[PDB]
Every structure is written in C-alpha cells, then in structure tokens.
Design a protein around this ligand. Structure first.
Ligand SMILES: [Cl-]
Ligand SMILES: [Cl-]
Length: 162
C-alpha cells in the first residue's frame, strides 16, 4: 500500500464532472474544480486544467495526471507549512501518508487548523490524538473516511485499508 493507492480508495475515480460530498464540482480522483455553483465555471476550470476542450469529460490518463499533480502539491504544501512540516518530519512512513491524505482532502490550511491533534501526533501520543481528531466537523461529515485515516495514525499500519 502507498499514498496513491490509499487516496484512490478514498476518493474513487470518476471521468465525468461530479459533485463532491460538500456539493462542489469535482472530477477524476478527487480533483476539486471550483466551489462555484456554476457548471460552466466548472467546465471552464476543467479545460484550463487539462489544456483542451473537454466538454466535462476526461480520460483515465488525464485523471491520473491531475492526481499525480495533486499529490505532489499536497506534499509540497506540507513541506512549506511551518505548522505541518515539523509533524511530518517526526512521523514514520505510514503515518506520513495519513497526513498527506488529510492535506489532500482539506487543504493545508484546514489541516494546519488541527493544532491540538498535531501536537499530540508530534508527541507520539497515538490514542490521544485519535480521540482528538474525532472531535471535528471532518469526522462528523465523512466519518468512514475519517475513521480510516484516524486508525492509520493510531496504529501506524495499513489495516484500515485492507
Ligand atoms: Cl490544475
Ligand atoms: Cl465517509
């Protein structure tokens, strides 16, 4: 298991524009297009992202290309974030993937907002962090996915994804 496979399980793969859990226009493997309610605005952002007139549909290869870019960006966002970098550096390989997953889903700002959890993770207080992570809108809104990430942080294994 790895970050790519993990996120592919969590986000799915859709080749036509769709609405995410928050009702936002998305495509491929969890690639957010826009928060705007307009499909046209979505189609426009899509074409600009792909470099062609897509008519709201992309191929598997195009989806994967967006995905590679998105993962790279998440990582890079973590490394540039003063609150995130230190935690990431302190963690083992498996838990690093859990942190990338959160950043991919909620953005650097959102993840960085988990001040208390981050500190606990940095202290390697697994059970406490898991409890704290659960007291969030994130957990209440997408509980199954949140549980998978939380277990990953808690155990340092991929058990929740097998
Ligand atoms: Cl893009
Ligand atoms: Cl969920």
């Amino acid at each position: 298991m790895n970050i790519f496979e993990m996120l592919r399980i969590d986000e799915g793969l859709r080749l036509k524009i769709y609405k995410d859990t928050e009702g936002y226009y998305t495509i491929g493997i969890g690639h957010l297009l826009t928060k705007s309610p307009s499909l046209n605005a979505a189609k426009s952002e899509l074409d600009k992202a792909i470099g062609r007139n897509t008519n709201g549909v992309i191929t598997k290869d195009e989806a994967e290309k967006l995905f590679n870019q998105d993962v790279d960006a998440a990582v890079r966002g973590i490394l540039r974030n003063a609150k995130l970098k230190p935690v990431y550096d302190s963690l083992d390989a498996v838990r690093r993937a859990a942190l990338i997953n959160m950043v991919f889903q909620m953005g650097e700002t959102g993840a960085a907002g988990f001040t208390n959890s981050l500190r606990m993770l940095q202290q390697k207080r697994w059970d406490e962090a898991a409890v704290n992570l659960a007291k969030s809108r994130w957990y209440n809104q997408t509980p199954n996915r949140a549980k998978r990430v939380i277990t990953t942080f808690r155990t340092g294994t991929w058990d929740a994804y097998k």
